[PDB]
Amino acid sequence: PSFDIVSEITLHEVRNAVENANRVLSTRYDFRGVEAVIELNEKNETIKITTESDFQLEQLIEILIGSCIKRGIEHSSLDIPAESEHHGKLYSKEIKLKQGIETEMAKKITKLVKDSKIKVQTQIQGEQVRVTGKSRDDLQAVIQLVKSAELGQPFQFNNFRD
């Protein structure tokens, strides 16, 4: 048998979170008279945040995170750069939506499996990790293992095949 490890982001839920975050943002006493933009590029899978200083960026980030929590979206699905791009008077950050599993994260998954000694095979393909084993009880252990760890982005488990 097998199962797929996946990392999917429901954009629908994300657009919802960004709307909430713009409503909070428009009532912020400390942002009155201050440029501050929180936009979603649904085609690019990016959330662009722009304001007048790195501090204020941090402040926008807390809003964002504060909106995922309200929408029960896991914040770690956001890939937020450490540095800001400074343009004239403005500073911004392109925040990436973690849609799927890139090789780097897949290798952290595959590595964890090797280390757990569970007798299952891993195939890094597409944007997922397929876990194949003789034993369903082992496959379940794998699920608990990956759930327990903090590799860095949320995972889902589907396509259980016999």
Residues lying near ligand MMC in the complex (CB under 6 A) are found at 17, 64, 67-68, 73, 78
Q: How many CB atoms lie within 10 A of CB 64?
A: 24
Task: Return the residue matching tokens 């304001």.
Answer: 51
Tell me the closest approach of the beta carbon of residue 71 to Hg ion, in angstroms: 7
Residues 5 and 126 sit within 8 Å (Cβ to Cβ): no
Tell me the closest approach of the beta carbon of residue 94 to Hg ion, in angstroms: 15
Tell me the closest approach of the beta carbon of residue 98 to ligand MMC, in angstroms: 12
User: Which listed residue (18, 36, 49, 68) binds Hg ion by CB under 5 A?
Assistant: 68
- Interactions with Hg ion, residue window 17-56 (CB under 5 A): none
Residue 130: enclosing H or E segment and its boundaries? strand 128-133
Rounded-to-integer distance, Cα 158 and Cα 115, Å: 23
Residues 30 and 52 sit within 8 Å (Cβ to Cβ): no
Nearer to ligand MMC, 36 or 139 (CB): 36
Identify what 67 binds: ligand MMC, Hg ion, none; CB under 5 to 8 Å per kind: ligand MMC
Q: How many CB atoms lie within 10 A of CB 4?
A: 19
Tell me the closest approach of the beta carbon of residue 66 to ligand MMC, in angstroms: 8
Bridge-based pairing state of the strands 128-133 and 120-125: antiparallel
For Hg ion, which stretch binds (CB under 5 A), given 38-46, 49-57, 69-77, 122-130? Answer: 69-77
CA diameter of the chain:
63
User: Which listed residue (73, 105, 129, 139) binds Hg ion by CB under 5 A?
Assistant: 73
Query: Which residues contribute to the site for Hg ion (CB under 5 A)?
Result: 68, 73
